[PDB]
Amino acid sequence: TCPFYKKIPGTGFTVDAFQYGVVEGCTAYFLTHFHSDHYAGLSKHFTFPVYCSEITGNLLKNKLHVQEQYIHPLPLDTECIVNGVKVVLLDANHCPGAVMILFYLPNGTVILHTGDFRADPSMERSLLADQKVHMLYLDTTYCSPEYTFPSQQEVIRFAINTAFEAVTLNPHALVVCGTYSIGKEKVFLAIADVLGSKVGMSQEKYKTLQCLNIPEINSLITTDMCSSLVHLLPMMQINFKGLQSHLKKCGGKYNQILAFRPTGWTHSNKFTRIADVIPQTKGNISIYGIPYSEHSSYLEMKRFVQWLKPQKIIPTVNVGTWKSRSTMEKYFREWKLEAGY
Ligand code: NI
C-alpha cells in the first residue's frame, strides 16, 4: 500500500505516489520530476489532478500522453494555492524540471519535500530562508560518509579536456555518451560544444530533449547521426560488445571510440581523485566511468540539514532495511547535536 513517507499530513496530498492505484482520500497528486521510479503508473488514462513544474508537464503530455486537462503546471518561486493550501515549488538541482515542494498547512506547520535533490549553498538564499520548516521529507540516496564526490564543474572539466585531446590527436575518433533517462545533459552538451559538433541521437531521445526548455537546443542536438561526432546511446549499450557493434554501423567513418558512462557513485571515489581516473580499454575502444552526481553527497546533505534545522526528518530513500533506517537516524542525531538544534 502507499507508504507513509509519500503522504502529506493535514492535506489530501501525495508525492510521487502513482503506482498504488487510487490512494484513498487523495485530492491532488504531486510529481517532483520525470524519473520512472517516481512517475511509475501515470498514462493517458489518469483522471486526477497532477501538480508539477512546466517542464515535467511537457514530458507528461508529450511522452506519456497524459491529457492536458489533468496537468496543472506551476511556476517556480511563486506562492500558489492548491485545494486551499499555499504551496511553493523550488529548484531541486537534480534533472531538468525537478522541484522541491514547500507546503504551508492551515494549522501553521511548514513541510519541505525535497523530491530528489543535490543540495547546494544557493538554496540557503531562496524562499526557504524566510520561515521555519518543521518537517523535512529528505532525499537520503547517499546518506553515509563514504559518499564523497567532486563538483559537477570539476567533472565536466575532465570530460571536456579528455574528449578535446582525443579527437585532436585522432580526427577519426567518435565520442559516445550513455543515457537512460533525463538528467546529466551537461555531459554530452559540453563535450559537443568543445568539438564544434551537434549531438546525434534517436528520434525518441531528441523528442525528450525538445520538452526541456533548454535555450538554443535546436543548435546543439540532431537526429542525423552521420553528420555528428558525439553520439548518445542507451546506457545498456555502453560496453565493448555494444560499442564494437555501433562502430560497425558507421561504415568506417570512424576507427576509435571514446565512451563516457556518467555513473552516480562507484567505490574508486573513496581512493581516487578526478585527475587520477583511467578508462577500461579493449582494442580501439575506451570506456570512462565519471562520477557525475545529481544527488547530494553526504557532506552536502549534512550542511543543508544543519542550516535548515528541521524539527523532524522523514527519509524517502534506503528505507527498506532496518540496518539502513537505524544508521540514517544515528547520523541525523549526530548532526543535531553538533549544530545545537
Ligand atoms: Ni531522480
Nearest CA among 226, 222, 182, 188 for reference residue 206: 222
* CATH tag, 148-295: 3.40.50.12650
Distance CA 122, CA 107 (A): 29
The span from the first CA to the last CA of the chain, in angstroms, equals: 34
Question: Count of residues for the chain?
Answer: 341
Q: What are phi and psi of 102, to 5 degrees?
A: -100, 120
Separation of CA 308 and ligand 1 centre (Å): 22
For the chain, domain boundaries: 1-147+296-341, 148-295
203, amino acid identity: Q
Strand 71-73 with 50-52, pairing: parallel
Secondary structure element (H or E) that encloses residue 37, with its range: helix 36-39
Task: Please give the full DSSP string across 240-268, using - where no structure is assigned.
Answer: HHHHHHHHHHTTSS-SEEEEEEEES--TT
CA 255 to chain centre: 33
Rounded distance from Cα 36 to ligand 1 centre (Å)? 8
How many whole angstroms from 153 Cα to the centroid of ligand 1?
20
Query: How far apart (Å, rounded) are the C-alpha atoms in residues 129 and 227?
Result: 48
Resolution (in Å) of the shown entry?
1.6
- Ligand 1 centroid, distance to 142 Cα (angstroms): 13
Q: What is the 3-state secondary structure (H, E, C) of 289-306?
A: EEECCCCCCHHHHHHHHH
Whether 52 and 18 have beta carbons less than 8 Å apart is answered as no
Amino acid at residue number 94: H
> What experimental approach yielded this model?
X-ray
> Distance (Å, rounded) from C-alpha 308 to C-alpha 269?
28
Grid cell of 169 as nine digits: 590527436
Distances (CA, A) of 129 to 136, 308, 315: 14, 8, 22
Task: In whole angstroms, give the CA distance from residue 138 to residue 15.
Answer: 12
Residue 326 CA to ligand 1 center (angstroms) comes to: 23
Cβ neighbours for 53, distance < 8 A, ≥ 6 positions apart: 33, 73, 74, 76, 89, 97, 98, 99
Q: What is the 3-state secondary structure (H, E, C) of 170-236?
A: CCCEEEEEEECCCCCHHHHHHHHHHHCCCEECCHHHHHHHHCCCCCCHHHHEECCCCCCCEEEEEHH
SS3 153: helix
Full strand arrangement of the beta sheet holding 280-282? 221-222, 199-200, 230-234, 173-179, 256-263, 285-291, 280-282
The amino acid sitting at 229 is: L
User: Among residues 113, 114, 115, 109, which one has the least CA distance to residue 132?
Assistant: 109
Cell numbers 575506451 correspond to what residue? 286
Give 196 Cα–ligand 1 centroid separation in angstroms.
Answer: 30
What is the Rg, in whole angstroms, of the alpha carbon atoms belonging to the chain?
22
CATH class, domain 1-147+296-341, is alpha beta
Sheet holding 135-138, edge to edge: 80-82, 85-91, 99-104, 110-113, 135-138, 312-315
β-strands 7-8, 256-263 pairing: unpaired
Ligand 1 centroid vs 118 CA: distance in angstroms? 10
* C-alpha torsion angle, residues 293, 61, 237, 36 (rounded to 10): 50
Its sign, for the CA torsion 63, 67, 69, 71, is negative
CA nearest 124: which of 307, 2, 339, 260?
307
Cell numbers at 268, concatenated = 574508486
Written as nine digits, the cell of 11 is 492535506
Rounded to whole angstroms, the Cα distance separating 211 from 234 reads 19
Cα-to-centroid distance, 191 and ligand 1 (Å): 23
Give dist(CA 73, CA 232) in Å, integer. 29
Quickly count: other Cβ atoms within 10 Å of residue 182's Cβ: 24
Spatial distance between the Cα atoms of 231 and 177, rounded to a whole number of angstroms:
6
Task: Give the integer Cα–Cα distance in Å for 295 and 116.
Answer: 7
